[PDB]
């Protein structure tokens, strides 16, 4: 059915953590654990520790996010 309480807010990349995970500083406030999407991992796209990215955050868990757009 899928819930529509998902936000598409922007953010800047900070630290380069292992296994395709980043620290991503939001332009709104603090930082989330944000992993790369399954759509972006298949289209490869190498994200550097300082790019502007859009995060797909779920309301159930604030610390977890998801990188949608490339640069």
């Amino acid at each position: 059915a899928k819930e529509k309480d998902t936000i598409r807010t922007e953010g800047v990349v900070t630290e380069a953590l292992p296994n395709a995970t980043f620290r991503v500083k939001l332009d709104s406030g603090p930082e989330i654990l944000a992993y790369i999407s399954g759509k972006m991992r298949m289209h490869y796209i190498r994200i550097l520790p300082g790019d502007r990215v859009v995060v797909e955050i779920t309301p159930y868990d604030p610390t977890r996010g998801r990188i949608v757009y490339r640069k």
Binding site: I7, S28, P30, P59
Partner: protein, 501 residues
Amino acid sequence: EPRAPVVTIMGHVDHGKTSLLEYIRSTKVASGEAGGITQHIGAYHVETENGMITFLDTPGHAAFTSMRARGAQATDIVVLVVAADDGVMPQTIEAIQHAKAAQVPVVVAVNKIDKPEADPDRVKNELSQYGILPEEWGGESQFVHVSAKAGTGIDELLDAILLQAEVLELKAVRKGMASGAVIESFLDKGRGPVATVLVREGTLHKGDIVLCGFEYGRVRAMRNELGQEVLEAGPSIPVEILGLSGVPAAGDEVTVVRDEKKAREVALYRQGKFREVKLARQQKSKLENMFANMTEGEVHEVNIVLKADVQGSVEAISDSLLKLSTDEVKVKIIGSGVGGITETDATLAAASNAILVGFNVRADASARKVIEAESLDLRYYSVIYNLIDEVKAAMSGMLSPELKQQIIGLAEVRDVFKSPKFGAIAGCMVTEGVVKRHNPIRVLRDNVVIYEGELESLRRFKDDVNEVRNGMECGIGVKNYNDVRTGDVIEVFEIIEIQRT
């Protein structure tokens, strides 16, 4: 035929509600004025036409609104306990509001007449004193100056309730369907799941069908014809454990036997509607709105745990604490041991759940050993507060002492004799100021102020330090070249903007 003039002890806290009742109980135990009377779980008897006078030992945290009925109050006459030195307080006017709305004829007991200065106390006599006069009349109420501990003024109080209790409401009624609440959902020795009840008004019959409140919802159960449904405490003669009765009246305590009553809750009505399903959805619906915007922050909530000897008391205090807007966590039945550890598990995060707040329940011997630690408080009357004050002192005690580093201020350092070079791990003595890490290093003012390097890591003996002051003499690691020498005076670069502080 004549029943009991139901009376309740209303008023402000610590005004003498419990102590007035302890003296009417002390003269009950004593021979002459009374004698061998029947024991009820919170009630006494009737007028000159039968026993004594029924004082309802008020719901655990001064609730009074539970002692309601079908239409009005379950009480016929009422006795208001006010203090002589305090006068009329905010809970005393709330007591007059519930007294005029239910149309119940009230008597005022002005307690603590032994407390005012230079007053001679004659024990167990009749009194003649005045005080709070602007709130009395024949259309209003009759005031009597009593002392709960000494016993003076009690002779005219029990007489003032008698001149008010001569009514017809002790015979006719009771006709309507039983409205009350249960007491406990326990297991008996001769039967399976049994349920003791407190009935405010109305009559329960031997074949009465009562709707009860479970954990899931509304399920009804017929009162067992096979076996003994209505089980009262057998009169002062030794036979079987309990005894069969037919129809219990208004103000009776009786142990009920029905079918499936296993998951039947604490604080339910004897007409029923309870769920943990709504309270979980009402809490989740307001937490779903608070977590849709909260993809960012923190702060947060409450606690409190209620447990009582009677459910007519649990339901009462729950409704009274929801009036004060203080939310509840647990209203279940058991002691501790396994409850004292779940309390210590939730103290690590937010100390707002640090207390096992008990009431009318007995603390176990195995529990007393886990309460030995101070981190958790134990209450046997019940409240909160001290909780949100413990977590407040936890995060505020670690943010203030963590300030010491940064800001490019003045500092001079001198390199000692015979100390190595490559990535310049040289021994250096501080002259003036505080030499920190990441601070820029320069050459003398005698020559040109050229960039010599920057401090990597400082080491005093064994410890890796961030700030070196006075003349500590440490092992300074710095990115240098031939521009540095041994015995040279180095000054830290104040960037022209940070120079003018």
